[PDB]
Amino acid sequence: SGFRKMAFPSGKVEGCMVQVTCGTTTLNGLWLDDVVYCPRHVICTSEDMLNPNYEDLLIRKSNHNFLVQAGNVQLRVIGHSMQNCVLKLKVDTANPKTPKYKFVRIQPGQTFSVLACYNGSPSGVYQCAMRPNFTIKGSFLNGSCGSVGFNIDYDCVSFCYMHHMELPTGVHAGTDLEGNFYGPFVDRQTAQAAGTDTTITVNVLAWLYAAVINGDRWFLNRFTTTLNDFNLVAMKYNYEPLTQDHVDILGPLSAQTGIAVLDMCASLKELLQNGMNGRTILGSALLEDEFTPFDVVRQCSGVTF
């Protein structure tokens, strides 16, 4: 027992990280088969940052301008292409450490692990959620661009995120591995509205189920509710609306605990209306929304990769 904010083991991704340098700018790249993926803003200078003309900037570059280094080994760049906001550098060597992988565009409210890297070397790994407003609340310093987010299923790494930007508000924005930003964001040094965020209701409920499984019992009450009644409360507290699709994915946790989903909703309603009264759940004094129902079952059942 016990419940932790657990990340995927990062070894398969560590072997794909490289350093990419174009002129003055060094960031991280992802080396998969014979292609290196990295943020296109590696080709900018500080003159460029307020609104770079990336097409014009890239036309001034040749294959030999992109320095790609994997540890101490230099890779030979034999082609380059810009796809949306990512650069794809073809190299003459396939990465011998390439895992089985896919590129996935995740949905808001899903979770993934981030391997934070600097100069192509790993610094740390942590778990986070894609917020409903398509930002992430990460831990990124200058030089972390090109660090990736991922999930692992069996032996397959699903890459879902590449880091590009810290907004002036201190939250983080990035792309899928085809270079399409999550959210309304563009790769320019500008104030950019992220828009209203909400709490991920289905994840809070999953975590309350995790709490019951691990022995935090105290928030269970004698009440139930309806999906309408609950969603009126969710709206007042800036929680995402709960749908039958969410009730369905909570099915396994409801069956394991014997607590019907709408009974758990009534416990969450009371917590929203009355607070925690100074008490804690799974070591937290707030309602946690960075565990999906899949995450809770995985951690409570010991799935390996």
Next chain:
Amino acid sequence: SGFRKMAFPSGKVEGCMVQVTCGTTTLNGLWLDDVVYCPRHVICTSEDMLNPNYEDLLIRKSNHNFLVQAGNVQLRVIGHSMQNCVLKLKVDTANPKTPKYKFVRIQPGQTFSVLACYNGSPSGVYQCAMRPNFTIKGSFLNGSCGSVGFNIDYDCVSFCYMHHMELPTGVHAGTDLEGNFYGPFVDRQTAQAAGTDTTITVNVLAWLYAAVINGDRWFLNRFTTTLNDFNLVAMKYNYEPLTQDHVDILGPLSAQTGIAVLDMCASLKELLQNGMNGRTILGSALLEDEFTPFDVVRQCSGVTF
């Protein structure tokens, strides 16, 4: 910016994990050079668990009774020895994936990353602290025994923890890699007192400095205190006493922020006496004590491995 409960990249440790089977019991082992380390209770049955005579149980075992499997490869066991509560199985092959490593016995209040494994395969990685009472609050299911905790400095893995036991209270106990338990615990299925735990004061202060660095500003006040006055408050709230050695290791964070350590202590005093008033610090509604001052500087400066 941003601050996350970050683990070390786990790849160097993933390549050392194996499965060890003795009779009916399967758990994890750590394969370093030509030795596999694992908890000695792999040799028990459920008859044995209330008070195993490990010397007698091991005398009934031979090298060929220990099945050690690294992925799909079987290792040949050519010797076995019991050191305190760990078994050391000499194998005829050195692990080609052995990193530079050392064995370290950590102090209470220090942090490390845990690679949770089942059947020799990694499941997840998370960061945690050794509690002042020498337990850890982990996430471990049956079959996780032999999972290890570690730190990484440059290219060297310092192994500090091997998982052995979940106490009836739901907290976790284990050994250093010489098999010596942290704390008063023994490897028997019995109720075992852990004794009073406390909050790790120097870590809370480090995290308050992390908060300031990242823009949580609101708990700073117009007050200061003394080490005596503060420690009277620490005692009342079951916080560890603060020493000049702790003030010294907080020096770098004090210099970066310009906030004297005793001024930060006065902010913490007010938080202990008055609570958070429904507000949050770095996404938490309680005072966080699982970041050391070294952790905060590392994450705020982007150290890689």
